[PDB]
Write a protein that binds this ligand. Structure first.
Ligand SMILES: COc1ccc(CO)c(OC)c1OC
Lengths: 300, 237
């Protein structure tokens, strides 16, 4: 179990860790988060009480270093920093735990929600989508645009997601125009899986990480990418059996975890109706279909 | 964007463009099988690709053999249309290639967009106008060349005959769409008007009779009456 201590909490802010959150008052005595499960990536995120503009946050993996949070009153945000002095950190943490000024990552033991949402997400890949290699952790926020979006402005602040377009030469083989447009199996299996991602696990990892940035930061592009990747699978007639079953699981927990009043903005009607009712794989997403019907039948 | 009454004049500017109509590409006669069921039998069709400014018609004849052993023909037909329009553009010299292609049915948008990926500077646009190009097969010479073809074949026409020597493209497109609209609403009567006077003939290198300017005014009038008439007969007014 690992710890992310906080220097202080000078401004009132709602703080999340993974799917949990709690309200911290201005100058409340709050000095960090303990018992963070090792073995997964995590995200710590922030929404100021005063300007709900800009949700922002940090992806990190405690295995990769000792990290802490400190408010910056010049740039006006809670910043993640790495501590290199090992004993300085343990001593800071132990003093804080002793005075019991830290909240506990509140994982119910029955609960595998986080693992299921982050099954395929690896800090190595996150850092290739969010480029900033002087840090071991990754900053994301509400307003960051993707490399694909910037095409159609500041690259240092881009989400370098996989470019995907259903009406591009990368997607459509010369002389198979109709075949490839109505069955994207070539694009999915040869171009993306074999070519770019190399295996399904990397593909699913990007997919999961896109959903999580959508949900936690309302990053519009992340929602577009998440939706697109799903659509490339559902619109493929030929998908490995093991991907289809895993996809049903992945989506099930994303739909399960979404706030019930955020469905209007983070979910695309066209994609879900197509994926669940009209596509090749309309019958291969039993769990996901079931939970979508009982929980969001308005959309369909 | 889309093409409508507000931007009607762009058709006749100097930017090369083509209308593509697919209605006559896949044509069937539905009939009864000996067992009482129903079957279709295809006949030849054509793609109707027209330069609204110069009047050049690229009549691509679609021979029934193209459908042999295929499924979902009404869907395939839009993709065959798009392949053939793309092949036509590719066949043309650079300075003859269109800058826009306007499809008359929105369902052709994605098929054409996808066949034209190699031409990103050619805008593919729909229209909100209800153009009568479906009636193209009421023109005897175009119908005849399609029904007689034994193989795929492209035939070139100027659908304005020699009219541009005397009128503008705008007037010539208006005359064409009025003639086509009349043929579509009542083909029998429309043809009667066009051939009533045995003294006015169709030159061997034309599609339409050789009317003087006064006679075309009279013809156009009679075509307008017919379109209003059939609208009363239809709706009773
Ligand atoms: C082409 O429209 C888009 C733009 C941006 C993103 C994400 O960067 C998209 O997700 C793939 C997308 O849909 C294709």
């Amino acid at each position: 179990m690992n710890t992310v201590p906080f220097t202080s909490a000078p401004i009132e802010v709602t703080i999340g860790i993974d799917q949990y959150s709690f309200n911290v008052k201005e100058n409340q005595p709050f000095h960090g988060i303990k018992d963070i499960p090792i073995g997964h990536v995590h995200v710590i995120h922030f929404q100021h009480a005063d300007n709900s503009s800009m949700r922002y946050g940090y992806w990190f993996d405690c295995r990769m270093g000792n990290f802490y949070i400190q408010y910056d009153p010049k740039d006006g945000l809670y910043k993640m920093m790495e501590e290199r002095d090992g004993a300085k950190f343990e001593n800071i943490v132990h003093n804080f735990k002793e005075r019991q000024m830290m909240v506990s990552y509140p994982k119910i033991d029955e609960d595998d929600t986080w693992y299921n949402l982050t099954e395929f997400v690896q800090m190595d890949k996150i850092r290739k989508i969010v480029r900033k290699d002087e840090n071991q952790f990754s900053y994301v926020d509400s307003s960051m645009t993707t490399v694909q979006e910037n095409e159609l402005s500041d690259p240092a602040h881009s989400l370098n997601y996989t470019v995907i377009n259903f009406k591009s030469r990368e997607a459509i083989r010369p002389g198979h125009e109709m075949e490839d447009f109505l069955d994207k199996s070539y694009y999915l299996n040869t171009v993306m899986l074999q070519g770019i991602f190399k295996n399904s696990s990397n593909y699913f990892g990007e997919l999961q990480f896109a959903f999580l940035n959508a949900m936690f930061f309302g990053n519009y592009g992340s929602s577009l990418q998440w939706h697109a990747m799903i659509e490339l699978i559902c619109s493929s007639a030929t998908v490995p059996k093991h991907m289809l079953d895993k996809l049903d699981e992945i989506l099930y927990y994303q739909i399960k975890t979404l706030p019930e009043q955020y469905s209007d903005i983070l979910l695309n009607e066209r994609v879900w109706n197509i994926c669940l009712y009209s596509s090749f794989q309309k019958n291969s997403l039993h769990n996901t279909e079931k939970i979508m019907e009982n929980k969001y039948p308005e959309l369909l | 964007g889309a093409m409508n009454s507000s931007n009607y004049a762009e058709l006749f500017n100097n930017d090369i463009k083509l209308f593509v109509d697919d209605t006559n590409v896949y044509r069937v006669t539905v009939h009864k099988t000996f067992e009482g069921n129903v079957a279709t039998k295809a006949i030849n069709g054509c793609i109707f690709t027209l330069n609204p400014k110069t009047g050049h018609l690229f009549l691509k004849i679609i021979h029934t053999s193209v459908w042999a052993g295929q499924k979902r023909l009404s869907q395939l037909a839009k993709w065959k249309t798009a392949e053939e329009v793309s092949a036509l553009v590719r066949s043309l010299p650079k300075e003859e290639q269109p800058k826009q292609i306007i499809v008359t049915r929105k369902a052709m948008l994605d098929p054409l967009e996808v066949h034209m990926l190699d031409f990103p500077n050619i805008a593919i646009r729909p229209t909100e106008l209800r153009l009568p190009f479906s009636a193209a097969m009421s023109i005897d010479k175009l119908s005849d060349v399609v029904m007689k073809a034994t193989e795929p074949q492209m035939v070139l026409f100027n659908i304005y005959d020699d009219w541009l020597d005397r009128i503008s493209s705008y007037t010539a497109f208006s005359r064409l769409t009025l003639l086509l609209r009349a043929l579509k609403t009542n083909e029998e009567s429309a043809k009667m008007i066009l051939l009533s006077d045995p003294t006015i003939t169709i030159k061997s290198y034309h599609l339409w009779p050789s009317f003087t300017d006064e006679q075309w005014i009279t013809i156009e009038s009679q075509m307008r009456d017919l379109i209003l008439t059939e609208y009363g007969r239809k709706y009773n007014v």
